[PDB]
RNA sequence: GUGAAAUUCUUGGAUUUAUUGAAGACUAACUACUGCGAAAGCAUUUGCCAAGGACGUUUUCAUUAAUCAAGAACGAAAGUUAGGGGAUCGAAGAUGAUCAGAUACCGUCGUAGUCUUAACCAUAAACUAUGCCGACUAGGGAUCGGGUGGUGUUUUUUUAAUGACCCACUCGGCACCUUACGAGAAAUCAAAGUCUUUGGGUUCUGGGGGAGUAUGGUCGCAAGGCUAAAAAAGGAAUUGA
RNA sequence: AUUUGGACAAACUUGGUCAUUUGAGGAACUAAUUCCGUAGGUGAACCUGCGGAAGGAUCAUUAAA
């Protein structure tokens, strides 16, 4: 693993976590437990999750003897397949490979928390901070900028770890938008995949690919089948007649000749509304 | 261990014949060499620091005779072995029996309840001391 | 006098086929596989697999009555490796010890004149 | 019922064949009972077994593999070991069968396999109890099956570019566990 | 794997019982070579059944056997050469065969190719007087002289192109003047490479000149009379 | 199919054998311290179209030249737009196994791409990490192209080519081996040399690393604007009292 | 097709019934590699696709009969 070597950046994490004494905190990756004893001093309830039984025994032996062990709780096992209770603050120091699905689970969590202080790679932090018009704008960037508001906190050097890793790290803050904007996550996901299979081409060409037209043909066909009407007959392929349909929606929207790396959230919302109005559903 | 980047001085047939055939022989020969050198050194030092005449210690196949025999040569090895070291007593094999060090054997079924209790208490205080 | 069959020995990299056909390759007398002789998944590419394979194939071939065999070994060919493996050499030794009259040995490995890309990538296929 | 095999010899390995021929035919004629001719007009060696003088059937194939190993360029005592045992195998593969390399990089790859004065090569030899021969591109490994497998793993990692220090550490680890077993 | 820990798949749900008795219902047929070769009788092949005389006829008409000229002619010095024949007519457990193609062996080709000489390849297509559209590949290596002190013996591209011209003309002329049986009789005792060498002794001194490959490409109208003639009638036994 | 298995597909018989047919790529070994091109680059045959080096020349004009901003041409791979077919491999992506060990972290399918036409894009460790033109200063053999001479062997002879090897000389290349009466911090350098301090002609350029700090010198980016919880041996214990 | 009267009457509510299984007290008993250009990435202590570089450690055999 990797051991943290800066209680001053631990102070920074807590002070920007901005804890209220009525909260419960989901702490992922306690490690040796400096953050654990700090938020045990700060908040009302602490739920520390862990996959490593050796570090879990280390933390419980460091903490056994305090009066705040009545508030401390440690849950062992992988939390991506087990149940996680309600928490108001979420603080995470895990290796980032589980942290990206952690971000998506924390977004899709019922009654989502108020704020989350996470550690990430520098690249991954810039990926979350990627605004439209920037070269790092991607599918995950648009998803997090849709479902939440993210803001950078600080940058951590690779020399501030024992042993030092190869990728520079950062600490970021995620705030889920309450309430959730009532858009279908699956439809938004399908549209984002189709537009971001190549982020600098034209959206018209991204639809001009073949298998995307196969998927949209099957979707519109089953949509018209559950609505119980029939198409008009095509002289060639059904993929080609629904391609003509997407041509119509693209030349009424006038976004078909635009850059996917520059189209922001509002343009995607207008386009998916146009698809929902014409009868196209990506899921 | 450490590998040798030099060419192996034996072929595949030789290394497999070797595997087809004291921790190490070179180590044992090193022990012999250092022991004889130390014997020569202690001989020289006793020559220098002693008062009375001391001779040279020693000089450094076939059926051999050992002249000095550390037994009266009509004492069999089993007769030299003590009756304690060829059969001790221990905890018996079956879990239905307890066998103490004084030779008695007690089944777990023909006992009484207070006897079972005192045996448990004795084993408990023995375990607590250990 | 004797009668000749063609023993095509495909020594794959993780398998071994010992397929005996007649002349012209139309009628197949017998065919086995390394795993099918020895029930594992490591040992489907073993000299022991090849030995059991060639022994039972020589049994079936002598049952039909073919005394002599020309033998055509083969590697996997293609853009992969082009040399017959230890499984193939083991199968050949096992046939010679099983006692079919070996007539003539060939190595018909399909060598691409100018091959396409191979499965690896720019960094290298294995390990 | 006599039975015959033939086997070619390339000229660069025909000079050592003439040079050390007198230590090749005595095991073939004395312990294998195998009549040997050499056609210098076709640059080939012919092994014919006699119907009555020989005993074992596999003797002919063992002798053919013996001459084949010496032809591919192994040392005489090592090919004698191939004759002596019954489960020695020879494996061959190429640098373009691992990763396509273009010229100067291929030269440096063979340089990394060989090592300074054959150090890395003899390290692989002594570790996995095998014999390695590097031709122009084709490489040849002689030994037991699992041994040549592990040697192939180490060589392929060397081709892909693992430095000799790292691959030497892995050699001494696999040699430690192989000595323990 | 037939192990008990081999995880079952869709696979072996419904099998069949091994009762086909295949090498009792199958039948052996002897093939025979054209009269141009010395030892014609070679091997026996397997016909699937005899209920279908149509089946026997069609399978044996499709048969394409392959042999080597050493075993076909008794002289083991033709070890590297190899021919393919195809069977076209049957008569009572005996098959009449004709020529189909030729090849070397890959070990001979690899042993021919060396590292200090140039390789020259001629790749011609023709049609003999028997209307067999054919394709002939030949190779030739640029050897070094008896006085050569240079290491390599490379030929200039002009000499290469000139030798391709000469070899192409030689092959086309001889195999257009000849017929297919006459072509096989020319092809056996290596006379065509001798002619190529005798012609190109003045352009550049060569070695290992060989007609590497013959490939049939079209086949003319059938003639069982011509087959019987180039190979070299039968009554019953009054069953009752 | 991997180190190990598993998704996958196989009685309507897979993998394999034989005979073929189609498709689009690619041009193995031969392959060299060889060649061509201004560089990137260039390998099947044959034909066509133009172009070029070097040699040879008792041909021809007679300073027409060197270095040079602006601008122009060309510029690997990836990448964009619009067409084409799309076999192979395959950023993204979807999945199988997540088994200890990563010593020995993959497998299956596949969008874009790869390929081709027409236009953009103009960048690389695009390297001999070294402006160009001219001149002079060491020897040694090679190898490619051209030429001259001689000598034989292979060759062939009123037929359409008279080439191959040898040796000597010779230009012009790709390079190499020894060394400098030279240079230098030294590695090294036939140029990074041209007798101690300096002039053959000419375009461009200059006056180390991390750290700590101030920023008006500058470019960018944010959030919320109804929403709240209140001390424990009152232990441990198949190990105790 | 439809219709009359009975009995069986599934199933459901409201329960009554007995039967059989299934929360923490007390009360017992037993047992004890480095990089460059480019393109891209959501199980991202980095990875991948394409083309390049060494600024990355060369042993053995090799004229002819």
Swiss-Prot record, chain A:
This is Dimethyladenosine transferase. Belongs to the class I-like SAM-binding methyltransferase superfamily. rRNA adenine N(6)-methyltransferase family. GO terms for biological process: maturation of SSU-rRNA from tricistronic rRNA transcript (SSU-rRNA, 5.8S rRNA, LSU-rRNA); rRNA methylation; rRNA modification. The gene is DIM1. It comes from Saccharomyces cerevisiae (strain ATCC 204508 / S288c) (Baker's yeast). InterPro entries: KsgA/Erm, rRNA_Ade_Mease_Trfase_CS, rRNA_Ade_methylase_Trfase_N, rRNA_adenine_dimethylase, SAM-dependent_MTases_sf. PANTHER family: DIMETHYLADENOSINE TRANSFERASE, DIMETHYLADENOSINE TRANSFERASE-RELATED. One of its GO terms (molecular function) is rRNA (adenine-N6,N6-)-dimethyltransferase activity. It catalyses: adenosine(1779)/adenosine(1780) in 18S rRNA + 4 S-adenosyl-L-methionine = N(6)-dimethyladenosine(1779)/N(6)-dimethyladenosine(1780) in 18S rRNA + 4 S-adenosyl-L-homocysteine + 4 H(+).
From Swiss-Prot, chain B:
It is found in: Nucleus, Nucleolus. Component of a heterotrimeric complex containing IMP3, IMP4 and MPP10. Interacts with snoRNA U3. Component of the ribosomal small subunit (SSU) processome composed of at least 40 protein subunits and snoRNA U3. Interacts with the SSU processome subunits EMG1, IMP3, IMP4, KRR1, NOC4/UTP19, NOP1, RPS4A, RPS4B, RPS6A, RPS6B, RPS7A, RPS7B, RPS9A, RPS9B, RPS14A, RPS14B, UTP1-UTP18, UTP20-UTP22 and UTP25. Involved in nucleolar processing of pre-18S ribosomal RNA. Required for the early cleavages at sites A0, A1 and A2 during 18S ribosomal pre-RNA processing. Belongs to the MPP10 family. This is U3 small nucleolar RNA-associated protein MPP10. The lineage of its organism: Eukaryota, Fungi, Dikarya, Ascomycota, Saccharomycotina. The chain holds residues 398 to 539 of 593 of the full protein.
UniProtKB/Swiss-Prot annotation, chain C:
GO terms for cellular component: 90S preribosome; cytosol; cytosolic small ribosomal subunit; nucleolus; nucleoplasm; small-subunit processome. It is found in: Cytoplasm; Nucleus, Nucleolus. N-terminally acetylated by acetyltransferase NatA. The keyword Acetylation applies. Residues 118-127 have a biased composition (Basic residues). This is Small ribosomal subunit protein uS11A. Keywords: Acetylation, Cytoplasm, Nucleus, Ribonucleoprotein, Ribosomal protein, Ribosome biogenesis, rRNA processing. Present with 29600 molecules/cell in log phase SD medium. There are 2 genes for uS11 in yeast. InterPro entries: Ribosomal_uS11 (IPR001971), Ribosomal_uS11_CS (IPR018102), Ribosomal_uS11_sf (IPR036967). Component of the small ribosomal subunit (SSU). Mature yeast ribosomes consist of a small (40S) and a large (60S) subunit. The 40S small subunit contains 1 molecule of ribosomal RNA (18S rRNA) and 33 different proteins (encoded by 57 genes). The large 60S subunit contains 3 rRNA molecules (25S, 5.8S and 5S rRNA) and 46 different proteins (encoded by 81 genes). uS11 interacts with eS1 forming part of the mRNA exit tunnel. uS11 interacts with snoRNA U3. uS11 interacts with MPP10. Component of the ribosomal small subunit (SSU) processome composed of at least 40 protein subunits and snoRNA U3. One of its GO terms (molecular function) is mRNA binding. Residues 107-127 are annotated as: Disordered. The keyword Amino-acid biosynthesis does not apply. Belongs to the universal ribosomal protein uS11 family. Its main location: cytoplasm. It holds the Pfam family Ribosomal_S11.
UniProtKB/Swiss-Prot annotation, chain D:
One of its GO terms (biological process) is proteasome assembly. Keywords: Cytoplasm, Nucleus, Phosphoprotein, Ribosome biogenesis, RNA-binding. It is found in: Cytoplasm; Nucleus, Nucleolus. Its main location: cytoplasm. Residues 103-155 form the KH domain. Signal peptide: none annotated. GO terms for molecular function: rRNA primary transcript binding; unfolded protein binding. One of its GO terms (cellular component) is nucleus. It comes from the Eukaryota. Disulfide bonds: none annotated. Required for small ribosomal subunit (SSU) synthesis. Has a role in the processing of early nucleolar and late cytoplasmic pre-RNA species. Recruits DIM1 to nucleolar pre-RNAs. Indirectly required for cleavage at the A2 site of the 20S pre-rRNA, forming 18S rRNA, and at A1 and A2 sites of other pre-rRNAs. Belongs to the PNO1 family. Component of the small ribosomal subunit, ribosomal RNA processing complex (SSU RRP complex). Interacts with NOB1. This is Pre-rRNA-processing protein PNO1.
